[PDB]
Amino acid sequence: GSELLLLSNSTLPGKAWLEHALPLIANQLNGRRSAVFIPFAGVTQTWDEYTDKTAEVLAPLGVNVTGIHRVADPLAAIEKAEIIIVGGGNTFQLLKESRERGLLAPMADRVKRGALYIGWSAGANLACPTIRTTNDMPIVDPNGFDALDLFPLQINPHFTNALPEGHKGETREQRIRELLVVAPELTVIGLPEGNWIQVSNGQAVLGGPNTTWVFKAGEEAVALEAGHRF
Amino acid sequence: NLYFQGSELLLLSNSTLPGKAWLEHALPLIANQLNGRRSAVFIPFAGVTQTWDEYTDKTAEVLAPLGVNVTGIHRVADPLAAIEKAEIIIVGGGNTFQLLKESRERGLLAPMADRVKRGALYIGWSAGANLACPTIRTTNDMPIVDPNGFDALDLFPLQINPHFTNALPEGHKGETREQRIRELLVVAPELTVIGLPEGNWIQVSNGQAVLGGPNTTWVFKAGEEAVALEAGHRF
Numbered sequence: 001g002s003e004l005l006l007l008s009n010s011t012l013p014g015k016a017w018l019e020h021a022l023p024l025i026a027n028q029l030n031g032r033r034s035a036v037f038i039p040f041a042g043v044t045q046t047w048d049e050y051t052d053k054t055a056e057v058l059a060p061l062g063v064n065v066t067g068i069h070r071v072a073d074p075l076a077a078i079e080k081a082e083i084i085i086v087g088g089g090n091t092f093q094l095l096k097e098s099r100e101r102g103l104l105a106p107m108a109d110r111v112k113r114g115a116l117y118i119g120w121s122a123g124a125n126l127a128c129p130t131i132r133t134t135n136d137m138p139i140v141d142p143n144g145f146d147a148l149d150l151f152p153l154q155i156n157p158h159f160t161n162a163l164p165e166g167h168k169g170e171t172r173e174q175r176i177r178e179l180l181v182v183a184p185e186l187t188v189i190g191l192p193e194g195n196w197i198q199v200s201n202g203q204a205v206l207g208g209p210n211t212t213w214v215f216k217a218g219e220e221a222v223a224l225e226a227g228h229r230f
Numbered sequence: 231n232l233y234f235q236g237s238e239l240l241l242l243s244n245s246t247l248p249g250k251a252w253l254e255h256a257l258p259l260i261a262n263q264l265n266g267r268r269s270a271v272f273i274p275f276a277g278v279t280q281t282w283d284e285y286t287d288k289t290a291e292v293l294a295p296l297g298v299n300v301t302g303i304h305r306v307a308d309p310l311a312a313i314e315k316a317e318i319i320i321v322g323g324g325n326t327f328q329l330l331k332e333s334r335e336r337g338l339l340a341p342m343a344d345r346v347k348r349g350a351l352y353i354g355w356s357a358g359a360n361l362a363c364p365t366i367r368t369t370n371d372m373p374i375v376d377p378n379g380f381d382a383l384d385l386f387p388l389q390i391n392p393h394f395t396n397a398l399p400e401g402h403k404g405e406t407r408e409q410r411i412r413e414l415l416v417v418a419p420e421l422t423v424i425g426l427p428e429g430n431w432i433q434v435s436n437g438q439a440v441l442g443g444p445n446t447t448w449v450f451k452a453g454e455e456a457v458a459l460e461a462g463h464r465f
């Protein structure tokens with residue numbers, strides 16, 4: 001009963017920021033226009049700049065964006081929002097700010113009550129039960145890895161198993177396999193750049209041109225393509 | 231500009247060089263720093279995909295020719311007594327979050343740090359190098375378990391980012407390693423982050439922290455361009 005758009009990344013090569021998301025958002029708005037933007041993943045630019053950038057790219061769709069860090073009453077803003085938009089950046093800072101501000105439960109409840117959730121990269125991580133499949137560096141302690149729990153599977157965004165020539169560090173699959181040792185019940189979706197998962201009208205639909213990989217404990221990786229229904 | 235460092239540390243970026251055996255490049259470094267020490271306790275908790283028993287036996291085997299006797303801290307009767315009596319503390323690579331979580335849950339963090347401060351030799355590679363720093367905030371590992379805090383041993387005052395490379399797979403739009411480090415420098419502007427490439431190490435001995443290894447090391451500080459360093463540099 002949730003409406004989610006979970007994107008692996010913001011920008012396709014040679015395209016504008018969020019350009020590929022616009023038609024997906026347009027088809028899922030269903031008349032919604034009022035959005036609150038959660039900017040807390042952003043580190044290297046101000047949350048004001050991040051909000052203004054998001055407002056600009058979505059304006060042609062008729063969406064009005066308000067930055068949650070600028071409103072007097074963030075709980076009321078989330079309550080009245082039709083759309084909750086969570087930007088990419090550092091997933092640990094995103095979760096830490098969201099938890100410290102008491103926004104996790106309100107955001108999840110608002111989405112469960114029919115609001116559209118749009119998140120890319122770190123914003124896709126936050127939709128999962130935990131952030132345990134983020135690729136980000138732990139620059140701040142979020143005081144727990146539990147997240148919004150709007151999507152039941154773990155998403156690993158920006159998925160690629162490639163490494164620089166001669167690198168001896170863990171592959172992405174090796175990192176994921178370690179998670180499957182400690183949490184053997186999990187399903188991990190390796191969502192490559194350019195892909196997304198759209199949850200709408202009772203179906204979780206895989207989208208994007210590249211191959212998606214599913215990892216489960218003790219099972220070989222399974223390749224999926226656009227149109228798969230979870 | 232570090233002041234006199236009174237600990238004996240060997241902090242390796244990684245375990246295995248291309249075309250070499252596991253820890254082969256570390257053996258001469260360990261041998262030349264032992265200074266007569268023989269008794270080592272191994273901290274295996276970073277290991278996920280193999281048992282800590284297998285990890286310990288592997289470490290014991292590779293170090294036996296150096297005269298080092300290895301016991302795994304997970305199977306001693308009294309881990310606090312084992313650390314107190316150990317001459318060498320060896321912390322293996324693996325997942326840094328699990329390493330820190332087990333070390334904290336078992337109450338070993340302070341005993342390990344205190345024993346090293348009391349003259350024990352500390353050897354760590356990869357996750358074991360992260361653990362020597364004030365925090366694990368520069369690990370490259372996935373947060374598969376919650377360590378209940380990112381504070382670590384605080385034996386080495388600067389942050390090490392091991393396996394350092396700024397390269398990305400063809401066409402990848404994710405963050406570069408330097409971009410991830412620059413974000414840490416926003417939230418923690420006082421930090422120095424050492425981008426320690428594979429094949430390199432930092433050896434703290436006789437009061438000096440000395441860079442080692444054939445590859446270029448990069449130092450990141452807030453608002454400053456990355457600084458290239460080479461073997462022999464004193465931090």
Ligand SMILES: N[C@@H](CC(=O)O)C(=O)O
Nearest residue numbers: 088089121122134135136
């Ligand atoms: N840091 C990434 C998310 C991830 O890779 O976990 C982003 O938001 O772009």
Ligand SMILES: N[C@@H](CC(=O)O)C(=O)O
Nearest residue numbers: 323324356357369370371
């Ligand atoms: N996981 C790495 C450590 C790191 O890259 O942070 C290792 O132990 O080999």
